[PDB]
Amino acid sequence: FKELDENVEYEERESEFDIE
Amino acid sequence: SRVLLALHDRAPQLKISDDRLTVVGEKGYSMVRASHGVRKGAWYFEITVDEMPPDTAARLGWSQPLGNLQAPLGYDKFSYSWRSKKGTKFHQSIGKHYSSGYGQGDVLGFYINLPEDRGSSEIIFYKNGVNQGVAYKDIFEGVYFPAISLYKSCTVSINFGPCFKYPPKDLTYRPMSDM
Amino acid sequence: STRRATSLELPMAMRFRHLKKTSKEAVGVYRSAIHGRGLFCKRNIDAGEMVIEYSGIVIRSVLTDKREKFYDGKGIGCYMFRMDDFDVVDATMHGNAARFINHSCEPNCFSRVIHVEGQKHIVIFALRRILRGEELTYDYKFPIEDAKLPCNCGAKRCRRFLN
Ligand SMILES: Nc1ncnc2c1ncn2[C@@H]1O[C@H](CSCC[C@H](N)C(=O)O)[C@@H](O)[C@H]1O
Ligand SMILES: [Zn+2]
């Protein structure tokens, strides 16, 4: 797993809540 | 009391205009409900897409008070939504082909019937006065408020009535403003 | 003349933007007698001192259930920290050494949400003087569940379960 430095805000997409 | 967008039944990130008939979306999908809801009869309102930049989207329709304000419309069993992108209809976050999509400059109509006794409720959507067909039948029972769900800085305006730019020709109804 | 009050929020901001240099001198990952790998203390650490931030991908709080069913469905792991009633730090795929901190019922550190500039960060502070070599540790404060994650913090008065 890649390791972070600061916090990174997630950028949602339009289908982020949809069952595929 | 004027039927407007709600003062507090709203996701705080959404930008609401002073007269509470306009909303700009912020980032991920978030929802605002109107100030009044209906439980019996046929009711109507119109939404105008003021501006729809690329990669922004809307899911518009009818919601119950328990619907999630921090999720898109139609995420729950409490809301039913119509997505600009591809015209998909949504309920419990299941997307189904319903109609063609809509975009900037279109005026959309929202018809709901909650007949008195049991009578079969339905939801019908309109694009610029044109019936797109029945979207849903026999929906979850309860009180439904006009709901707006926007993804990423698009702007939409709402008309609760009493007079609409494209009043439906084939159905009887009362405007939401009568509430 | 005007009476002035002391700002606790100014030195906290000054302390935070030095944390990333501070933690790399202070902490390290080793094998734990509690569980797997754990974060340990590489130099004497004083009370109230900031140890490290629980950095990750900050997603909205509504996306937790979908995230957990994708994580726990694919068998990946929890690695999620609640920041707010609106925001949650997902360190599952992107994080730092703070995700190796184990839980105890008798911790020597505690978690706190603080504000710097306009954002919030989850930072771990030392509850007491912590000597070089100790394993750093805080109370996860998991929600209580039913038939259960066994805890191995190995200190007496241990609640016998992580939740
Ligand atoms: N006190 C404890 N007893 C048993 N398992 C623990 C524990 N504290 C943390 N864990 C485990 O560690 C996970 C948190 S990640 C913490 C670091 C972990 N030791 C590792 O090597 O990756 C939890 O899912 C839990 O299963
Ligand atoms: Zn324990």
Side-chain angles (χ1 to χ4, degrees), chain A, chain B, chain C residues 1-131 133-163:
Chain A
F1 83 99
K2 296 313 194 85
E3 260 165 299
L4 214 29
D5 318 65
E6 309 128 24
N7 277 329
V8 168
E9 268 197 34
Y10 185 57
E11 192 173 350
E12 306 181 22
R13 84 197 66 103
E14 200 277 313
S15 54
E16 187 75 49
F17 297 75
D18 302 336
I19 286 161
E20 296 294 326
Chain B
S1 56
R2 208 94 41 201
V3 185
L4 308 156
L5 302 163
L7 246 175
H8 310 87
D9 219 354
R10 61 164 67 165
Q13 57 263 58
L14 296 166
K15 312 242 208 91
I16 310 281
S17 69
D18 308 310
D19 63 7
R20 302 153 50 178
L21 293 192
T22 320
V23 47
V24 169
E26 181 69 332
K27 286 153 140 176
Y29 263 124
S30 54
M31 181 210 296
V32 62
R33 261 176 305 247
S35 45
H36 295 98
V38 295
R39 182 196 296 283
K40 55 212 81 184
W43 299 89
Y44 204 70
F45 68 97
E46 278 191 328
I47 295 204
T48 307
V49 181
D50 287 338
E51 182 175 50
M52 183 138 287
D55 290 311
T56 76
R59 289 148 186 244
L60 316 163
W62 296 90
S63 191
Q64 285 201 33
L66 288 168
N68 204 319
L69 288 179
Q70 281 296 340
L73 204 66
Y75 175 71
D76 281 329
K77 56 204 200 233
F78 301 128
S79 35
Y80 299 80
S81 56
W82 186 25
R83 187 177 58 160
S84 68
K85 176 193 211 164
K86 283 158 173 133
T88 323
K89 52 140 172 282
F90 284 97
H91 177 70
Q92 293 181 72
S93 295
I94 270 60
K96 311 192 155 177
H97 182 81
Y98 166 55
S99 85
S100 299
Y102 53 90
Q104 168 172 321
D106 292 322
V107 188
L108 315 157
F110 302 85
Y111 163 87
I112 196 177
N113 185 17
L114 292 175
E116 281 268 28
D117 305 4
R118 310 210 232 276
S120 266
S121 46
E122 68 197 341
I123 280 145
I124 289 141
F125 291 128
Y126 290 77
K127 193 167 117 223
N128 289 308
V130 172
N131 194 295
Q132 307 296 293
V134 201
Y136 293 100
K137 264 192 121 303
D138 325 304
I139 58 154
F140 182 30
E141 262 216 59
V143 40
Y144 284 88
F145 295 67
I148 294 163
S149 179
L150 295 181
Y151 166 88
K152 268 185 187 243
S153 283
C154 38
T155 308
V156 292
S157 266
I158 191 148
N159 190 7
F160 295 101
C163 273
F164 308 98
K165 176 175 209 90
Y166 297 110
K169 284 192 80 203
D170 51 347
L171 289 191
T172 46
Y173 59 96
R174 291 179 66 176
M176 280 292 311
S177 54
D178 271 20
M179 281 293 314
Chain C
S1 322
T2 316
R3 295 148 199 189
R4 296 178 298 180
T6 289
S7 199
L8 301 211
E9 309 94 83
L10 229 45
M12 201 74 120
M14 197 82 219
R15 189 100 39 92
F16 170 80
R17 61 146 164 280
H18 291 357
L19 183 275
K20 236 161 59 163
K21 179 160 300 275
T22 302
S23 66
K24 67 96 180 141
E25 172 127 339
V27 305
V29 186
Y30 315 95
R31 167 257 187 195
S32 165
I34 290 169
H35 178 285
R37 284 161 303 166
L39 204 55
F40 290 65
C41 168
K42 300 208 318 289
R43 57 137 169 114
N44 262 25
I45 281 165
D46 311 310
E49 198 197 308
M50 308 202 331
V51 172
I52 198 177
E53 171 182 40
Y54 195 98
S55 64
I57 305 297
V58 182
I59 70 178
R60 268 196 292 168
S61 159
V62 63
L63 290 172
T64 41
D65 275 31
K66 183 234 167 178
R67 216 91 159 175
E68 294 199 326
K69 208 160 317 318
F70 166 58
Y71 286 156
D72 288 327
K74 293 271 217 244
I76 305 191
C78 329
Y79 285 106
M80 276 208 315
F81 213 134
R82 174 155 286 277
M83 213 172 228
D84 226 26
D85 273 9
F86 303 93
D87 295 298
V88 165
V89 198
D90 188 6
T92 301
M93 295 304 152
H94 307 108
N96 60 347
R99 67 182 264 165
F100 289 108
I101 309 198
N102 281 305
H103 164 96
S104 193
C105 321
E106 211 149 278
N108 42 48
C109 301
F110 76 97
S111 45
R112 185 195 164 150
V113 168
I114 61 124
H115 283 90
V116 172
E117 278 199 279
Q119 229 350 42
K120 23 186 201 284
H121 307 282
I122 297 164
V123 187
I124 311 293
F125 303 73
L127 271 176
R128 54 171 179 77
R129 203 170 161 268
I130 305 184
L131 295 183
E134 282 188 58
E135 180 179 5
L136 307 171
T137 278
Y138 65 93
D139 183 359
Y140 277 2
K141 299 163 155 16
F142 275 162
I144 300 291
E145 282 195 49
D146 199 274
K148 59 152 83 134
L149 210 169
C151 175
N152 201 32
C153 60
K156 63 221 92 64
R157 326 297 189 202
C158 163
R159 286 134 213 164
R160 204 228 204 280
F161 289 121
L162 282 207
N163 53 9

